[PDB]
Amino acid sequence: KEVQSDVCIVGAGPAGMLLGLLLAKQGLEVIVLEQNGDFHREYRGEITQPRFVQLMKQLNLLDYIESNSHVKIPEVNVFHNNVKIMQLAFNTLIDEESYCARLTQPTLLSALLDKAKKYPNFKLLFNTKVRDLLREDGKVTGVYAVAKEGNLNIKSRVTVGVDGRNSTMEKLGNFELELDYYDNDLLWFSFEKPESWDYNIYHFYFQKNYNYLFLPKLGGYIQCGISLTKGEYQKIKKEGIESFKEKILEDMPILKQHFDTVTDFKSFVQLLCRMRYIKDWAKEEGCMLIGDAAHCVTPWGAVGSTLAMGTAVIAADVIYKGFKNNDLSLETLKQVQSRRKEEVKMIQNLQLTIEKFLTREPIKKEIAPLMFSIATKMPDITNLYKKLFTREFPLDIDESFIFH
Amino acid sequence: KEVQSDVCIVGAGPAGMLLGLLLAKQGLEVIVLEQNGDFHREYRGEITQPRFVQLMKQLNLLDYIESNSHVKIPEVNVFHNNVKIMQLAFNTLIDEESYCARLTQPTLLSALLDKAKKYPNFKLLFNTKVRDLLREDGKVTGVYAVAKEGNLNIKSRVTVGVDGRNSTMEKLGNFELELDYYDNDLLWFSFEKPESWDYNIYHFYFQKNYNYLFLPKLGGYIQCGISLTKGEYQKIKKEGIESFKEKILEDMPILKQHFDTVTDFKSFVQLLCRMRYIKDWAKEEGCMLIGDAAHCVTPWGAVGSTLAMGTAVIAADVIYKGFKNNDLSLETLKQVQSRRKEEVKMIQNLQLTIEKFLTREPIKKEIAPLMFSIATKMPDITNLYKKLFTREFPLDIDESFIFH
Amino acid sequence: KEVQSDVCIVGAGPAGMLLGLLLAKQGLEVIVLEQNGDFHREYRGEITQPRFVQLMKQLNLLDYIESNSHVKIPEVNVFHNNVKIMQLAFNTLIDEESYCARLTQPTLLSALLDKAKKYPNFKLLFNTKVRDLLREDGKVTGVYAVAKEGNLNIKSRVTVGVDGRNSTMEKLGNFELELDYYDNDLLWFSFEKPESWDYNIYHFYFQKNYNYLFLPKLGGYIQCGISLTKGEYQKIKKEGIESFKEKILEDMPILKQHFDTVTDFKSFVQLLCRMRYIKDWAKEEGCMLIGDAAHCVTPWGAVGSTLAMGTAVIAADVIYKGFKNNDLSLETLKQVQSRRKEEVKMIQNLQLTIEKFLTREPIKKEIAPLMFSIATKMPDITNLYKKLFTREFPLDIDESFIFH
Numbered sequence A, B, C: 001k002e003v004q005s006d007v008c009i010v011g012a013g014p015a016g017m018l019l020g021l022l023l024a025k026q027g028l029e030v031i032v033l034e035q036n037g038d039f040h041r042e043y044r045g046e047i048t049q050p051r052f053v054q055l056m057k058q059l060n061l062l063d064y065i066e067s068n069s070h071v072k073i074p075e076v077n078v079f080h081n082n083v084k085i086m087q088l089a090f091n092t093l094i095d096e097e098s099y100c101a102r103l104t105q106p107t108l109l110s111a112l113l114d115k116a117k118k119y120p121n122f123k124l125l126f127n128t129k130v131r132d133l134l135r136e137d138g139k140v141t142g143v144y145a146v147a148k149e150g151n152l153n154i155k156s157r158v159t160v161g162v163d164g165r166n167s168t169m170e171k172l173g174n175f176e177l178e179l180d181y182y183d184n185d186l187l188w189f190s191f192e193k194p195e196s197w198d199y200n201i202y203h204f205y206f207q208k209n210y211n212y213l214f215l216p217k218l219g220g221y222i223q224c225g226i227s228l229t230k231g232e233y234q235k236i237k238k239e240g241i242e243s244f245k246e247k248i249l250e251d252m253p254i255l256k257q258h259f260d261t262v263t264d265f266k267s268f269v270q271l272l273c274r275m276r277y278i279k280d281w282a283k284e285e286g287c288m289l290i291g292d293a294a295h296c297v298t299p300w301g302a303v304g305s306t307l308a309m310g311t312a313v314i315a316a317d318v319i320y321k322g323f324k325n326n327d328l329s330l331e332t333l334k335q336v337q338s339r340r341k342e343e344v345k346m347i348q349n350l351q352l353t354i355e356k357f358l359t360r361e362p363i364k365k366e367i368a369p370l371m372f373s374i375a376t377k378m379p380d381i382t383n384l385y386k387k388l389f390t391r392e393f394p395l396d397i398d399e400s401f402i403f404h
């Protein structure tokens, strides 16, 4: 059918969903579309940042978010050859409360949906794959989508895409990619937590054969990612499962119990560490790109979700200002990028610098952990930690967006 | 009065001058405006790069330029506490001709002008500072300038600004700065060459107090740049000339003879190591920013002039193609940036990495040279050399640009 | 025959000898057996630590030992390509007197023997090589040895093995060895001291071909050790003496006068840099392994003798406590290991980290020296110096062990 509204957010991710309710409490007609059936269809990570806590307290949602199931990671540890080389507790970064949080994306999305659906002007449609844009009169008037019931021409003055790195809307509008980075990947597998370890951990190991990352998998497990170069996993698959198991157990002898029942490669998940940046997030009238669709980043420090959420809150700010001033021009849509540009670019440069440490070249794989140990012992490093984990000042938002 | 041409180039530096004649030999009408009375008025540099040799040989200009006054520099040396830690002969980078050169901008510009003025369709005006842009019918039509003898209203299909880092057309057209970096400065002074030293040198020194750069100043002298942090030269002036002289002679005792007659700071010249990148070099029809006005860089590797010249060559190719096809809109003008983007950005990122070694912070200052040594002993380092000093492939340009 | 006492110490090296007299003044019955004829038979080193001085002045023995012949080494220097990269004066590590000391093991052992022989309950037998343990009634009750006159069945409640790395009692009791490290060796030779050098030196040199160590050999000479990889010595011997001499003199031209008279490999002495750690030093009643037989280490920093002496002091404390308490079970003998474990493991890990600098691999050999320079320029290097050279707190022992 034909339904008309004010804001159409393609994608029900953590960003759009946030952008879903921030406008919903402002009295705007909001429709949020997702192609999936729910938030459980795809696993998009669990670890968050102290920046997330900062934003939740800034929006006065910290207590409501904390009431759900979560785990507080107090610090991050880096080991070299099973010897600790760096330690950083998140509570020393800012005076207020700060901590990493194992908080599943489905649970946070469910909480946001529960809070948002109390507003009648909010409509969330699942199983709705957007097909194209109603680019009419030289501007984006709405979107043509298929609901699965029928075909919808859903019109809105603003159409915002948060479709993630695998965004179809990136090419529906002529959005030019000015940064496409893909150099490494991760091999994820979950194993039962050993009794010698803690559950609330955030660990990175430099070892002889591979580099490892250990995170608190939901349910009392430990979720470990092995860092590999792009195009190296199929070489390992050809080389044989036995060699991979031997090289892993030589590096991490405690994984022997889990690998005793491992005999093949299909228990691992290949995560592609992609990073992207759109040349201009808004270039037409009524269309703009925020979230992972525009500034997706690598999962080092768990900054991607918080970055998307901050960009979504800035976009809600700009959209509300445009509605109040009756000025939703494209130059108003440039404001979102002009405000998030410094944060996003600084974060992306930090991620590039961190990814430089993951080199697996003959001499560089051996000099990287020592380089990391030198870098973490500089007196400046603390500031860098803040640049990577906290927002120095809260995002300038109107007091109307604060929840009570 | 009323002067009508095809191309109007504001700026007669090495880039525009090249763009001045590359189109001039194509048969187009070219007018080049310069505020200075000659090329000798400002000192704009001496050192070139093997990229310059590659570009000259590609255009079949190498013999003509090499017939002038130049000094071939075969290698760059780096020292730590007066002990060499790095060496690189340029002839090993590529199989063709590869060498740095001492070549003053005035003589290169004089050679280019001598070649260009033989074409009747090329005109050059000196002491003609551009004031306004003749923006009419929603597009840039020409420039209003003052010649010192009258007020000229020059009309041309293409108006190209190569004004340099201190560009007046940078704001006449609303051009945005995507990057603006300024972290260090160079204190330049020339001293007579000691008999122990060679003339065709390119030397860098990590010393106790200051880092030094030595280049062959024209006339049998040696020009030295002392690297300082931004805003630190005033502190040095306050502290006194005697302390500065003592710390300089402690680092480099060979400078004693020159400093025997230095009693004040009015002989050193301060250079601001600014690096800039324009968001989009073409944003209006009939106007464009290329060269140092768009992608000015730091003087680490002598890449600035060659980069500007390559941008000018690509711009000449694009402009000639557009004139041939009778299509000089904004879309075709936006091709120069797309064709120079990756090279310019890679060079700027390498410059940022190199400038990271110039830190004067308490702890980082003493380990920075050693880091540099570790950098120069990597197996990959030679590729980096090829990325910094040479061009992998010649510029994709039409055959009529080759001189005979 | 039949000899019955309290303590039987197999081995009369610096550790056991110390524990030989510490218990002797407690009134216990002690026999110390040594297979050698005297303390001059085997060269066991000359360099001590400030830790040794701390231990000697803790027992009120510093003035007695210092009355002998010794050379005070005030500092340790590290050079790279004949240029000093590190300096450390030991007196800045603790407020008390702190220095290294060239003190020949025969001299210290003779002083300890002279102090101990005044006690009639102390008996030392040279040329009495132990052969077996009298393990009876499910526990060790003594030793069967041969004195060169007769066969001695020595009976003692406590039997302590300090036989060293070549321990013959290491396998008499099934002592599990949980760390067997051997990666490098040292080629030792003594040469006449040049007048340009100081005698009391502790010098390390990173050079082009080999790494060198210079110590004050007794008699006004200089003891030099060339660091080599395991098994490389016989490759050098096959390659020829002349090539070895040329590569040595290229690295250290000051050695030309000594190497003018060198024409064979029979002047150098090969020392194997082994480092062992027994899993548990006490596993049954009436037997124990301490000292070099338990925690042998590499000779970097001169830590082995002081570590063995400290272990012997702790073992004497535990043995006296058990004898006074009348409790000499396995669980009270485990106290020595439980108390020395942290110190010994910290020292051994530091030795591993130091030995990592002695790599001779193609590219790693060149970045190792200036990797050493970086680590010595860290803000926390002084804590590492204190941990590697000094003891933070004195060993907790009774006043009865203090000499008067």
Ligand SMILES: Cc1cc2nc3c(=O)[nH]c(=O)nc-3n(C[C@H](O)[C@H](O)[C@H](O)COP(=O)(O)OP(=O)(O)OC[C@H]3O[C@@H](n4cnc5c(N)ncnc54)[C@H](O)[C@@H]3O)c2cc1C
Pocket (backbone or CB within 6 Å): A010, A011, A012, A013, A014, A015, A016, A033, A034, A035, A036, A043, A044, A045, A046, A047, A048, A128, A129, A130, A162, A163, A164, A165, A166, A167, A168, A169, A271, A290, A291, A292, A293, A299, A301, A302, A303, A304, A305, A306, A308
């Ligand atoms: C496999 C994986 C693992 C990750 N792990 C972590 C981690 O451990 N820690 C961390 O901090 N971050 C992690 N991330 C990143 C994190 O998920 C993102 O930063 C976050 O999702 C940002 O929100 P978003 O809405 O922009 O992205 P997404 O939530 O991924 O946006 C995509 C959403 O839009 C919908 N959609 C897409 N296209 C369409 C369309 N055409 N029509 C309709 N709906 C559409 C999808 O159904 C989905 O709901 C991970 C991401 C992935 C892909």
Ligand SMILES: Cc1cc2nc3c(=O)[nH]c(=O)nc-3n(C[C@H](O)[C@H](O)[C@H](O)COP(=O)(O)OP(=O)(O)OC[C@H]3O[C@@H](n4cnc5c(N)ncnc54)[C@H](O)[C@@H]3O)c2cc1C
Pocket (backbone or CB within 6 Å): B010, B011, B012, B013, B014, B015, B016, B033, B034, B035, B036, B043, B044, B045, B046, B047, B048, B128, B129, B130, B131, B162, B163, B164, B165, B166, B167, B168, B169, B271, B290, B291, B292, B293, B299, B302, B303, B304, B305, B306, B308
């Ligand atoms: C002190 C100094 C030293 C340098 N040393 C080196 C070096 O050793 N090596 C190296 O590789 N690079 C060096 N450079 C950089 C190098 O000079 C530039 O990168 C290069 O000239 C770029 O070419 P261009 O024509 O775009 O710039 P420019 O040479 O600056 O060209 C701009 C010209 O246009 C004129 N102009 C500006 N505005 C107007 C206007 N409104 N109307 C009319 N004319 C106008 C200017 O007067 C100037 O003549 C140095 C620069 C400086 C300032």
Ligand SMILES: Cc1cc2nc3c(=O)[nH]c(=O)nc-3n(C[C@H](O)[C@H](O)[C@H](O)COP(=O)(O)OP(=O)(O)OC[C@H]3O[C@@H](n4cnc5c(N)ncnc54)[C@H](O)[C@@H]3O)c2cc1C
Pocket (backbone or CB within 6 Å): C010, C011, C012, C013, C014, C015, C016, C033, C034, C035, C036, C043, C044, C045, C046, C047, C048, C128, C129, C130, C162, C163, C164, C165, C166, C167, C168, C169, C271, C290, C291, C292, C293, C299, C302, C303, C304, C305, C306, C308
């Ligand atoms: C060549 C060399 C150079 C060294 N240089 C230094 C140095 O510069 N600085 C430093 O701090 N350390 C040095 N050391 C190490 C130092 O000698 C030992 O760490 C130290 O002696 C430890 O004390 P210990 O008595 O347990 O060892 P040792 O003195 O080696 O113990 C062996 C003793 O036990 C006796 N013994 C062994 N087996 C039997 C048996 N079956 N029956 C009877 N007696 C037996 C031997 O006769 C000898 O007296 C060096 C060692 C060597 C081999």
Ligand SMILES: CCCCCC/C=C\CCCCCCCC(=O)O[C@H](COC(=O)CCCCCCC/C=C/CCCCCCCC)COP(=O)(O)OC[C@H](O)CO
Pocket (backbone or CB within 6 Å): A085, A363, A364, A366, A367, A370, A373, A374, A377, C076, C078, C204, C300, C301, C353, C354, C355, C356, C357, C358, C359, C364, C367, C368, C371, C372, C374, C375, C376, C378, C379, C380, C381, C382, C383, C384
């Ligand atoms: C080399 C033979 C010995 C020569 C010395 C002779 C006798 C005595 C002097 C002993 C000095 C030994 C210095 C050891 C330095 C060292 O590695 O210690 C470290 C130094 O601290 C650092 O982490 C600083 C940077 C460390 C750099 C890596 C050092 C270990 C690596 C060795 C390999 C070197 C060759 C290169 C191989 C790899 C190339 C591909 C201890 O660190 P920590 O975490 O315990 O504490 C921090 C510290 O206090 C600084 O803040």
Ligand SMILES: CCCCCC/C=C\CCCCCCCC(=O)O[C@H](COC(=O)CCCCCCC/C=C\CCCCCCCC)COP(=O)(O)OC[C@H](O)CO
Pocket (backbone or CB within 6 Å): A076, A078, A204, A300, A301, A350, A353, A354, A355, A356, A357, A358, A359, A364, A367, A368, A371, A372, A375, A376, A378, A380, A381, A382, A383, A384, A388, B356, B371, B372, B374, B375, B378
């Ligand atoms: C490797 C993955 C990391 C695993 C844990 C991830 C999760 C949490 C931990 C987060 C902490 C990460 C911080 C690492 C330190 C770091 O990036 O430092 C850097 C230090 O400075 C830099 O810019 C370093 C440049 C990039 C270094 C690349 C690493 C080189 C390693 C191996 C390849 C060897 C080839 C080079 C050898 C030559 C040496 C120079 C941050 O720089 P900055 O300018 O942003 O800030 C500087 C700072 O404030 C003080 O200098």
Ligand SMILES: CCCCCC/C=C\CCCCCCCC(=O)O[C@H](COC(=O)CCCCCCC/C=C\CCCCCCCC)COP(=O)(O)OC[C@H](O)CO
Pocket (backbone or CB within 6 Å): A356, A371, A372, A374, A375, A378, B076, B078, B204, B300, B301, B353, B354, B355, B356, B357, B358, B359, B364, B367, B368, B371, B372, B374, B375, B376, B378, B379, B380, B381, B382, B384
């Ligand atoms: C220093 C001023 C310039 C002096 C030279 C003058 C003229 C010409 C010579 C130019 C030679 C420049 C080469 C410098 C090395 C360099 O850029 O390498 C780098 C090597 O890798 C890096 O990114 C190194 C990190 C950047 C430098 C960090 C700053 C180090 C100094 C001080 C801060 C110390 C704390 C931070 C430590 C970080 C761990 C390394 C470029 O990386 P890449 O991936 O592009 O290339 C890899 C390469 O093949 C391996 O090295």
